[PDB]
């Protein structure tokens, strides 16, 4: 019985972060990081001026 | 000695011994298994913080 | 010393006087507690996948 709670925890806490990192792949392609780069230079260069 | 032969027939385990193994068992279930249960308690914790 | 055998013996199986009892008390809260806690866990995920 101990054995197998064991097990079940545990697969259930890997479905979960498995699932997790499917979101953040769709979430930031390629071109999106791109602009969010540019979006972070001119964020970045006006926290610096202020 | 009717009732010691029945004592010896009926004696396999001792009655002593039987008490030590039955007293070791539970020192070994709370020492090995019930903290090894703590422990998987406090993980499933863990895994729902995550969540 | 029969009569202690026995009253020894009985002590030990019946710990709450009225009950046998086949598993350590301690442990069998322990499972009670760890099935309660990934039952939650289960919701919570299948509440994520939904």
Redesign the interface.
Known sequence: NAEYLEAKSNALFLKLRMEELQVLTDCYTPEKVLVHRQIRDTLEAGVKKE | SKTQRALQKNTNPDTDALLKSLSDHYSLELDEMVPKMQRLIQQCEKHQEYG | K?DS?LK??RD?MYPEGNTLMLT?P??SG??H???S??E???H??VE??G
């Open positions: 029969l055998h020894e013996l030990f350590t301690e442990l322990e499972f507690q760890l099935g806690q990934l939650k866990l289960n919570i995920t994520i996948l």
